[PDB]
Amino acid sequence: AVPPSLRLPVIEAAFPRQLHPYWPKLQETTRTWLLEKRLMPADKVEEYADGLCYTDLMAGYYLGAPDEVLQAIADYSAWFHVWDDRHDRDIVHGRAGAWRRLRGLLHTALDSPGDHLHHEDTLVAGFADSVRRLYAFLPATWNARFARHFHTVIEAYDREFHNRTRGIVPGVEEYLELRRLTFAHWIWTDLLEPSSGCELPDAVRKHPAYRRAALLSQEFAAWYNDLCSLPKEIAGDEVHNLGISLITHHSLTLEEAIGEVRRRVEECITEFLAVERDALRFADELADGTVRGKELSGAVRANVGNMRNWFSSVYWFHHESGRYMVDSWDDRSTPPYVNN
Ligand SMILES: NCCC(O)(P(=O)(O)O)P(=O)(O)O
Ligand SMILES: [Mg+2]
Ligand SMILES: [Mg+2]
Ligand SMILES: [Mg+2]
């Protein structure tokens, strides 16, 4: 089971895990994609890819997604972790120019992914393949919203690059704002929509209950990552972690900061339970007797159900994934699955 310091009894009792039926094929298809797109060396794909559990993380989240939608999401999620690793290595090795050029290419490819499917930088070509596929499911209005959100994510990664190269730890509130962008809260929230087959109108997805449920699902996922990834992040000189901000700016000991992060995570769960009632009541209200109302109600219900599924998927991912097993590495500062 889960060690006491990381255990969340409410998740275990009230957020039962779910798994999408396409998971076995999803796992192998993403492994093949990482190999074919040269996002990881063949030996590292064979030794670590399945053990990283990226497809499991998505298959526990976007329940009900069409298989091809889930495949594009899973490829994107694996890509997103490889990009996190590249960013980290560029920082560690002082590759400011390589990072700046990658950042510019990602902004361009995000707006024009088809143009970049055969780019010489394999990380850019793999990004472009996953994004072009994500852009084929819903109207171009959704694509434009995904792009606006991801442009903001890329710039948050750039701010992290500057923080780490200058040895700056953000303040707590600065960190919490930044973390909604580096974790890509609004991208995961956008991806609920192709998974349930419907672009939600602005009036629906901006309803306060939908917005707050979406926010709390992501805050839990990001801050539980902070709690569980703290050991590897301290070992890797990462500065972006709520516990690190608390130690640096509020004078907490390691133990005190861990307890504070845990309490904030636990409160996300019970705040989510309150707002979920309101979001499901809104879903009921959307079912106004019309065909479109039934469609919107069902989509909102499926999306809020997946906001709930994110809690359990993220919880178990952190205990299953090889990504965080720092105690097993020869060099605690260099995870074996990254290209160093
Ligand atoms: N979400 C991507 C990877 C992370 O969660 P990880 O802790 O590096 O796995 P980050 O903290 O960098 O956001
Ligand atoms: Mg990271
Ligand atoms: Mg990161
Ligand atoms: Mg982390």
- Which two three-digit tokens encode residue 114? 């088809």
- CB within 5 A of ion ligand 2: which residues? 84
- The number of beta carbons lying within 10 Å of the beta carbon of residue 122 is 13
The answer to whether 225 is annotated as binding is yes
- Which two three-digit tokens encode residue 144? 């434009």
CA distance 99 to 161: 9
229 lines ligand 1 (CB under 6 A): yes
- Which two three-digit tokens encode residue 255? 């133990």
- Which two three-digit tokens encode residue 209? 């209950």
Backbone phi, psi, residue 5, to 5°: -65, -25
27 lines ligand 1 (CB under 6 A): no
CA-angle at 162, arms to 159 and 167, nearest 5°: 125
Residue 214 identity (one-letter amino acid): A
How many angstroms separate the alpha carbon of residue 84 from the centre of ligand 3? 5
Q: CA-CA distances (angstroms) from residue 75 to 91, 186, 287?
A: 24, 18, 34
Please, which residues have CB within 8 angstroms of residue 212's CB and are 6 or more apart in sequence?
Answer: 275, 278, 279
Torsion region of 339: left, alpha or beta (phi above 0 gives left; psi -120 to 50 gives alpha): beta
Q: Which helix (H) or strand (E) holds 266?
A: helix 254-286
What residue owns the CA closest to ligand 1's atom 6?
A: 229
Contact 48, 336 (CB under 8 A): yes
Strand intervals (E) in 51-175: none
Half-sphere exposure of 176 (CA within 13 A, CB side): 10
321 lines ligand 1 (CB under 6 A): no
CA distance 160 to 23: 33
Contact 78, 34 (CB under 8 A): yes
Contact 90, 106 (CB under 8 A): no
CA distance 249 to 246: 6
Which residue from 189, 192, 141, 209 is spatially nearest to 299, judged by alpha carbons?
192
At which residue do the structure tokens 């393949």 appear? 129
Q: CA-CA distances (angstroms) from residue 102 to 78, 94, 163, 305?
A: 18, 14, 18, 36
- Which two three-digit tokens encode residue 192? 């609920």
CA distance 213 to 265: 14
Q: What is the resolution of this structure in A?
A: 1.4
CA distance 184 to 178: 10
323 lines ligand 1 (CB under 6 A): yes
CA distance 219 to 268: 7
- The number of beta carbons lying within 10 Å of the beta carbon of residue 312 is 19
Residue 142 identity (one-letter amino acid): W
How many angstroms separate the alpha carbon of residue 333 from the centre of ligand 1? 15
Which residue from 324, 265, 301, 315 is spatially nearest to 13, judged by alpha carbons?
315
The answer to whether 88 is annotated as binding is yes
